[PDB]
Amino acid sequence: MDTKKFRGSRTCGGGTHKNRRGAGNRGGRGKAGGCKHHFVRAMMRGYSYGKHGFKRPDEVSRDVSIVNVGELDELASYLVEEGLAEVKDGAYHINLENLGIEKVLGSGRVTKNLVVTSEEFSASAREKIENAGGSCIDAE
Amino acid sequence: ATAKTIDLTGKAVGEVELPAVFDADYRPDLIKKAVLAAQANRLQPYGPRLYSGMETSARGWGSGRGVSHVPRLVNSSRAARVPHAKGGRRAHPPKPEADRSEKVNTKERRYAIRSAIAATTDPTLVSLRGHIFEAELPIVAVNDLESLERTKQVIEFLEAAGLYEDVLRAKYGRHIRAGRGKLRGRKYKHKKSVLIVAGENTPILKAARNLSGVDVVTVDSLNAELLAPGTHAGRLTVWTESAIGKLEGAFQ
Amino acid sequence: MIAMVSKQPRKQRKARYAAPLHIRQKFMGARLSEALTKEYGTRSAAVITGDTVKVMRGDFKGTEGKVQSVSLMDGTITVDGVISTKVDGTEVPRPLNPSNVMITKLEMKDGRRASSIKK
RNA sequence: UUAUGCUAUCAGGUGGAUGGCUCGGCUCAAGAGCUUAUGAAGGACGUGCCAAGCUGCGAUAAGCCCGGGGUAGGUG
RNA sequence: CAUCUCAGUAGGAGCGGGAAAAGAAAUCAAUUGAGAUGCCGUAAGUAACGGCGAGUGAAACCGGCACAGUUCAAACCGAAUCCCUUCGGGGACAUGUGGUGUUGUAGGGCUGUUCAAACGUCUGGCGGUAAAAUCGAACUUGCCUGGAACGGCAGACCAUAGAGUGUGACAGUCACUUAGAUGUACGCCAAAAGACCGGAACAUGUCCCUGAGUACCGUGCGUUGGAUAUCGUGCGUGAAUCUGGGGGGCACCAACCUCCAAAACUAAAUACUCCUUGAGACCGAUAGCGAAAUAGUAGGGUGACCGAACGCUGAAAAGUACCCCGAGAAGGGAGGUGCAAAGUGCCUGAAACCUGAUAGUGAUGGAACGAUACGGCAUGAAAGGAUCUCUGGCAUGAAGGA
RNA sequence: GGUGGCAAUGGCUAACCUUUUAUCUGGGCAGCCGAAGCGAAAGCAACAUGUGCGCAGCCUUUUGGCGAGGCACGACGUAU
Ligand SMILES: [Mg+2]
Ligand SMILES: [Mg+2]
Ligand SMILES: [Mg+2]
Ligand SMILES: [Mg+2]
Ligand SMILES: [Mg+2]
Ligand SMILES: [Mg+2]
Secondary structure, three states: OOHHHHHHOOOOOOOOOOOOOOOOHHHOOOOOOOOOOOOOHHHHHOOOOOOOOOOOOOOOOOOEEEEOOOEEEEEEEEEEEEOOEEEEOOEEEEEEHHOOOOOOOEEEEEOOOEEEEEEEOOOHHHHHHOOOOOOEEEOO | OOEEOOOOOOEEEEEEOHHHHHOOOOHHHHHHHHHHHHHHHHOOOOOOOOOOOOOOOOEEEEOOOOOOOOOHHHHHHHOOOOOOOOOOOOOOOOOOOOOOOOOOOOHHHHHHHHHHHHHHOHHHHHOOOOOOOOOOEEEOOOOOOOOHOHHHHOOOOOOOHHHHHHHHHHHHHOOOOOOOOOHHHOOOEOOOEEEEOOOOOOOOHHOOOOOOOOEEHHHHHHHHHOOOOOOOOOOOOEEHHHHHHHOOOOOO | OOEEEEOOHHHHHHHOOOOOOOOOOOOEEEEEEEHHHHHHHHHHHHHOOOOOEEEEOOOOHHHHHHHHEEEEEOOOEEEEEOOOOOOOOOOOOOOHHHEEEEEEOOOOOOOOHHHHHHO
């Protein structure tokens, strides 16, 4: 706190000089007082007691990266500019495994012709891709 | 943009186009931040000894003895170990593990450096900042300035370029400091005259070295202290053609 | 010989105070007259008993005389003519400092003196 | 000439604050890093012309011999 | 508060060097890869543990610093080997000295062919590092003040040297230094160049060899994030050997991937500060180490052990001659030294406290020691006033108003 | 919180190297946060504007109109 603000105040913003003794003016040390006298604060902070669910090992689980069709469509010109994509006979041939994306979602609009190869496709993503005349290949 | 180039005789022998670093707006707060960060990073840890004032086995006498409740020596009545007792420890002293280094992002640090470099173009900032000069800012010199090897030649050039009165001002402004700093190594208070910039290491960094106030550096050694001593831009400086070449995209 | 890494006053005064007694011979240095410097090539020299000095600073500016004694530990020399009087009246030598004198006549009796002055 | 006293200032005593100075302390960095039965570190006693303490030294006792550096004084 | 935490902390016993420990996969991965160890960053307050409370708490992948691999036992040969020495000789050794050999998409020996010699050890000292140390520019110029110029006013120079200290007051040019160069015994390092043991492939197989109370397992306890899935070790039980054995976070079966334990050594990157050097938005004598060191001292305790205070004359001792008082080597007076008593624990020299003097008051008098207004007495030089202080006249005069 | 740099083609680097003595200049994409959520888990995967009221501001006959941000709906992803 601002020490110079309190030169000549005695109590230094604490009230009586009987406050600020030690751990008993805080109710215990740490998150102490779980549900006897700090129960309401315990519930509001996000420290409620309980155990709920299980965990799978991290060896087997994976966290897929995603990209929506709108995002993939809008930045296609920049992708071919960087040499990532390819523009043979007009339709963009864009491969998602060189970027680092394992699944294509479907939020947004698609207007350009896209030939997208990847591992996974939501149903709506495939519907939107092929309603614009494009094609999707399950990359293996 | 364009600026007159003057030889060692003081005659304009060309007109060189400046790079885009010199064309930027003045920003005092960024320069402030950069200079303060570097000066904070120079510092050096200090503090008392590990167990100072506490190597003791004092015990209190308790109540009933007619005296206070402070710890005292085992074979006497002299208080010890507490901050208000003579010879006792100090409450909240400095600590050697305190880390006082500051951080500045590279983009804003480069931006402050560019802002400080562009400030030397303005005659007003240079003039009101303390210096004395009779030249057309900015001062640009032909590349043979890196060939000078005797201090007398550098003095001749400075006299012919109207920048020697600042050197004399720095020489005669050297004066003894006041306070406890004299006993610790900082005996004088110096003044800042002129900064000479060269593209590459040459004998000029050894000739214009003893002149009072003059600091000579290469283009790859510019920071914010050199250009804003005390967080005030407007430092007299000299450049060369090679130095101008080095600054096409130097800090962008 | 103590390089620029000795810019702290504490270190310099330690070096000058607790010096080996063969280094305190160097602190007995004094300027040479014009002829001496242009015939030996050293801008200065050391003061030794038996040579004529010319006082340059203090109460005796311009008085000449021989050096009557030198003390290494004190760092002071004694000169002819320069004296102080007691209360009862007794002329006493007054110590000086060799950096306030000028050597006009060297005393060559060692033989090693010439080599000692230079190189 | 109102004594014993009260208040304020001045001169002096006692006392050792403040200021100025500081061969000391502390912290960080760079180096360097084992020794002793061929008797170590540490201790007791002795050793000086006048010498009690500390420092050095050991009945050859603030010390002896040789090589180099240094040059006119030395005797912590 | 008992499991938990404090914490493998404080403390103890043993061993030990300039470093130590570790270290060349019976490894980590996941479908397919990597390729000894240590230390730093991140993963991450995540997985995991837990009166599932408080709390405790990793590793692998990945990025860096620094890089280095090898030696035995056995299969084959059977004294072909080692060490001491008086150089005569003596000891070790068939219960095995020495040669070959050292590994996994197996290796080696036996049998046959080929290519020939990589890493390493020794001599060598070209050349570097290398003690005290040596050299190192340019003013001690004129007038003023002063006790004394490094200061003020004028003038003259140096700089690869304007870091700093000393000197009768502020010093690039007075001294030591600095920048930049030379010199060095004993030692250490090391390049050319010579000598020394020798290594790398291929073909053939009812052929021979490859680390035991060990690996694993039951059971108890400690420890761990280690959860039926960490490590240790008390007791008990206990294998195989290439057509083999181990691992892939509960046990078993199958497929697939990966390795070869129970013998040994090994530089560098790292940790620390008795000690040497450097630096400091550090302290400046009740501070900073307990100690500006006759300081672990004086002193205190039977003992384990606890533990202070004390810095400073002046430029130069020039450290008070001679005379009077006094019993005086006390001390005082007069008189000197010094710019100045600064007169010896002597720079400056505050307050409390004590002695004297000056102003006000005072032996009929009532108290938080003062604030405000009016008077007496004393002072009012500087730094405060001069249409200012005092006394009156005139003009305008708000609220109020006889 | 106050003040700043950069800005979905996002922001910042850590250890370390260049240090020429601790500064400093230039590298360093490992990694962290943001960019997609829901669910114990397997798993699945959304509006790059469809409607209205309307402040500031602008236009205007000074009464109305357009109306970023704001508020209220509608539609959609997932769990039950
Ligand atoms: Mg202390
Ligand atoms: Mg031992
Ligand atoms: Mg090992
Ligand atoms: Mg623990
Ligand atoms: Mg110098
Ligand atoms: Mg002390």
